[PDB]
Amino acid sequence: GLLTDYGNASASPWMKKLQSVAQGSGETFRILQIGDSHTAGDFFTDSLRKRLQKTWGDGGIGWVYPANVKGQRMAAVRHNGNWQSLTSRNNTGDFPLGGILAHTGSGGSMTLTASDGIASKQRVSLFAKPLLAEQTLTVNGNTVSANGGGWQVLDTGAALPLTIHTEMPWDIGFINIENPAGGITVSAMGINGAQLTQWSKWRADRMNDLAQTGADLVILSYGTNEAFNNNIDIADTEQKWLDTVRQIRDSLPAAGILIIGAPESLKNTLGVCGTRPVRLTEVQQMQRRVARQGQTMFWSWQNAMGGICSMKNWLNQGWAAKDGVHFSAKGYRRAAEMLADSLEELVRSA
């Protein structure tokens, strides 16, 4: 119902990897959710994280912020250091995939500490761009060096708590922190206010970054902010979305793709039903058509909530925030548990 497969998940390379993980192959199945504020809060993705890791294995915390990001949250890790984040929300820059970077400065320091969960040894990768080629940094004392200049991914091995020292300045992107025993990771790549087309704000080679995430399931979670643009061109947007899906399949041939249809939002809540933004329905329908033409999976967040005229009720019962757009912690948890439910069923239907 809530989940519609317009591809063939049962015969896909990524289902086969997941089934094999479910049986104890020791591999790591990486779920990567790229989206807007709903994603950036981590309440949704973290619920998804906890659910699917109990079911199929805790593969570690995955790709996390390199530093605290104002107005955004990482549930799985805590940050202590002097690095300074920058995001594509209000700014321009040479962003790697995700639209977040952090300026380390000289004499730079960052420690990441695991919230709950396990706390021993880990595989570590970092998106990173040095000021100078061949430049180095340390990860738990161990010297790690760039190869040439420009954004690249640095691979090494460490353990949590993770401490990173930069004698000279770097820009750092997301940091991958994987448990060697394998399992599931759920990575959240959110930007408050973001629309999918705004990957255009990130660097030209952003798809090479995507290719390097090792994502087995890319979840695209947008629509809310597109829906508040009263003058949005749906046909232009639809083409951009199909292009993006195409680029994702080129970049990650083996990954599945899930598009999350936008939740009901309200332009105002004075209705006892509220009133929807004028372009919301067109945006949601566009997203489903893209899913079908791109042969992706589609999960209807609006239908998860109960369909049209459901947001007002969610608000009244405290599962959605007062603004009729964002959700409460338990609202996001609830919604993601339904998504997790939907995915386990899809898998169970072997």
Check which CATH number belongs to the domain holding 341 and give it.
3.40.50.1110
Number of domains in the chain: 2
CB atoms within 10 A of CB 299: 21
User: What count of Cα atoms within 13 Å lies in the side-chain half-sphere of residue 178?
Assistant: 27
Closest-CA residue to 127 (of 105, 90, 98): 98
Verify that 178 and 46 share a domain, yes or no. no
Residue type (1 letter), 308: I
339 and 197 in a common domain: yes
Note whether 196 and 339 are same-domain residues: yes
Answer yes or no: do 205 and 327 share one domain. yes
CA gyration radius, the chain: 20
Resolution of the structure in the document, Å:
2.2
Alpha carbon dihedral 35, 37, 43, 47, in 10-degree steps, equals: -20
Same domain membership, residue 191 and residue 54 = yes
Judgement on whether residues 163 and 124 belong to the same structural domain of the protein: yes
Question: Residue with structure tokens 């705004």?
Answer: 198
| Cα separation values, 169 from 129, 135, 292, 307, Å | 9, 9, 45, 50
Q: Are 11 and 98 within one domain? A: no
Residues 201, 338 within the same domain = yes
Q: Is the dihedral of CA 334, 330, 44, 276 positive or negative?
A: positive
Round to whole Å and give the CA distance between 61 and 75: 9
Give me the residues paired with residue 77 across strands: 114
Are 200 and 327 contained in the same domain?
A: yes
Contact 31, 187 (CB under 8 A): yes
List the determination method.
Answer: X-ray
Count of beta carbons in the 10 Å neighbourhood of residue 162: 19
**Which are the contacts of 233, defined by CB distance < 8 A and separation ≥ 6?**
none
Host domain of residue 304: 1-59+183-349
128 and 233 share a domain? no
